[PDB]
Every structure is written in C-alpha cells, then in structure tokens.
Symmetry: C2
Subunit: 183 residues, 2 copies
C-alpha cells in the first residue's frame, strides 16, 4: 500500500490490480508479469525495477520515476505516464496504445518495436531514444524533443510533429520521407 518500502521485493506474477501504491518505494523490485492494471503508482519510485511482461493497462504512473526500468513487452495500454521519468528505460515491444506521456522524460529510452499508436507524447523528451520499428499511427509528438533519436522514415509521415525539435539530419530525413530527393 501507499508509501511502502518495497525495494528489491520479489513480486513477479503478483496480483496487484487496482492496488494503491502511490509514492511507494519499488526500486529494484521484481515485478515481471505482475498484474498492475488500473493500479495507482503516482510518484512511485520504480528505478531499475523489472516490469518485463507486466500488465499496466490503465495504470496511473503520473510523476513516477522509472529510469533504467525494464518494461520490455509490458502492456501499457491507456496508461497515464504524465510527467513520468523514463530515462534509459527499456520499452522494447511494449504496448503503449493510447497511453499519455505528456511531459515525460524518455531521454535515451529504448522504444524499439514499441506500439505508440495514438500515444500522447506532447512535450516529451526523446533525445537519443531508439524508435526503430515503433508504430506511430496517430501518435502526437507536438513540442517533443527528438534530437539524436533513431527514427524510421515512416514516423515522419504518421506522427504529428508541430513544434517538435529535430537535428538537421532528421529535418533532411523528414523531407526525404515526404518524397523529396537529396540525390
């Protein structure tokens, strides 16, 4: 429950659906394949936590710290990650369909093959992030910072990017993605 010290806790496959874990300390906790659907994890500390395969759909992770956390293949559908810190987190193959990541810090995060369909990434920082293979149908990246991130040409044609900050290289890739030849 709230504010609990659960650092390094063994909680893999645990049923924690709709649990109230606001401000909980879950650093280095093992939560892989845990059911955390609809859980309240507001301002929880999940630094370096293992959430591989975890069910987090409709969870509230507002203001949580998930830096270096493992979210590979996690279900984050319709989750709230407003102002969440996800620096160098691993979201490879995670499902973030309809998730809200407004203001999130995804500096150096791995989003390889992540589903970002209809995800709100407005004002998010994505510097040095890897978006190879990510699906960005209906994704919103307005005012996001993309500098130094790895991105497929298809992102330039699918995500809204008004105000998004990019490299010169990315600006050129954006152009080529829309059909212009630099040949």
């Amino acid at each position: 429950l709230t504010g609990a010290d659960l650092s390094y806790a063994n909680l893999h496959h645990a049923n924690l659906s709709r649990a109230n874990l606001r401000s909980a300390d879950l650093r280095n906790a093992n939560l892989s394949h845990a059911n955390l659907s609809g859980a309240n994890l507001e301002e929880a500390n999940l630094e370096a936590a293992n959430l591989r395969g975890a069910d987090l759909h409709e969870a509230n992770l507002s203001g949580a710290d998930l830096q270096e956390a493992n979210l590979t293949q996690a279900n984050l559908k319709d989750a709230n990650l407003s102002d969440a810190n996800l620096e160098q987190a691993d979201l490879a193959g995670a499902d973030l369909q309809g998730a809200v990541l407004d203001g999130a810090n995804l500096h150096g995060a791995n989003l390889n093959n992540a589903n970002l369909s209809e995800a709100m990434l407005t004002r998010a920082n994505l510097e040095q992030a890897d978006l190879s293979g990510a699906r960005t149908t209906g994704a919103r990246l307005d005012d996001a910072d993309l500098r130094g991130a790895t991105v497929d040409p298809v992102l330039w044609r699918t995500a809204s990017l008004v105000g998004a900050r990019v490299d010169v290289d990315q600006a050129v890739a954006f152009a080529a993605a829309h059909g212009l030849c630099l040949a």
Copy 2:
C-alpha cells in the same frame, strides 16, 4: 506566318491572335502588349524578345526558345510551354495559372510574384530560379529540380514535390515549413 524571319521586329500592341508562327524567328522582337492569345509559337525562337504585358493565354509555346526573354506581367493562362526553354527569362508578375511547363528549362528564371496556381511544372528545371512571392496553390513540381532556387516557406506546404530535387537547406526549410523546430 510560319518560319518567318521577324528578328528585331517592331510588333508591340500588334494583333496576332491565333497566328501561325510555328518555327518563326522572333529573336529580339518587340512584342510587348501584343495579342498572341491562342497563337501557335511551337519551336519559335523568342530569345531576348520583349513580351512584357503580352497576351499569350492558351498559346502554344511547345519547344520554343525564350531564354532571356521578358515576360513581366504577361498573361500565360492555360498556355502550353511543354519543353520550352526559359533560361534566365523574366516572368515577374506573370500569370501562369493552369499553364503546362512539363520538361521546361527555367534555370535562373525570375518568377517573382508569378501566379503558378495549378501550373504543371513536372520535370522542370528551376535551379537558381527566384520564386519569391509566387502563388503555388495546386502547382505540380514533381520530379522538378529546385536546387539553389529561392522559395517561400509556403511553397513547401502547397506544391506537390514528389521526386523534386532540393538542397540540404531547402530540405531543412521544408521541415520548418511543416512545423518542425531546428531552434
């Protein structure tokens, strides 16, 4: 009439509507404010000719040479300039609404404040051309060469540019024109 030597001819304000001037030599001719509407000027030589204010709407200028010609404020509505040579021609304030310029050479041409609405500029060369103030609503610039041309941000948002060749700078301006910040 056809193939006529009319070089340096004084023909300003002349009525030459629907005239057959195919292959005519009109180098350095003065044709300013001449009525040339629907005229046949296929493969005519109009090098350095003065066509200021001329009425050329629905004229056939296919394969004509108009390099260094003066077309300022000319009416070129629905004219056919397929494969026309317009190198360093001056089209400032010309009306090219619905004109066909497929394959045209507009290298170093001046299109300042030209109306290019619905103009077909497919495969045209526009290197070093000036398109400041030009209206490009519905213009087709597919496979055109734009390198080194001066162009307003609005062109990047209005003209079709599939296959169009651009500078790195232009590719960056294209990006910024669509809302990306290089700030």
